[PDB]
Design goal:
part of a larger assembly; 2 chains; A: 49 residues; alpha+beta; 12% strand; B: mainly alpha; Single alpha-helices involved in coiled-coils or other helix-helix interfaces; 1 helix; 7% strand; mitochondrion (chain B); membrane (chain B); electron transport (chain B)
Chain lengths: 49, 82
């Protein structure tokens, strides 16, 4: 963002980021898994502080 | 009454973890480990609890036996005869 034209940024990315690769192997793009919230309580009682 | 949480004692470098009561079973491994626990607890005290009360039953089983024997008549009919 700034005083830059979108065409210049796209062309610059095409020049340098074209060497980047995707879908490397069977993993390709890994997917996330849900994380379960757990009602709990942690108490680090330190009276010095 | 001049004593509440905040000034009870000085506790340092102790971390505690706990779970929500709704995220854990109220009766977890009740008979799986509770029953083997009670056997452990009973043995740890049966050598200091049972002998004092075992003696009382021995007193019971003898103090009551002698009482009926006193009420029972004894064969002391001699020296009178016919």
């Amino acid at each position: 963002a700034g005083g830059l034209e979108h065409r210049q940024l796209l062309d610059l990315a095409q020049k340098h980021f074209s060497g980047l690769s995707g879908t490397y192997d069977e993993d390709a793009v890994p997917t996330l898994s849900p994380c379960r919230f757990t009602g709990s309580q942690i108490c680090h009682r330190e009276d010095g502080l | 009454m001049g004593r509440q949480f905040g000034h009870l004692t000085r506790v340092r470098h102790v971390i505690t973890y706990s779970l929500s009561p709704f995220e854990q079973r109220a009766f977890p491994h009740y008979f799986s480990k509770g029953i083997p626990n009670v056997l452990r607890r009973t043995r740890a005290c049966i050598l200091r609890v049972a002998p004092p009360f075992v003696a009382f039953y021995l007193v019971y089983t003898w103090g009551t036996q002698e009482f009926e024997k006193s009420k029972r008549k004894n064969p002391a009919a001699y020296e009178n005869d016919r």
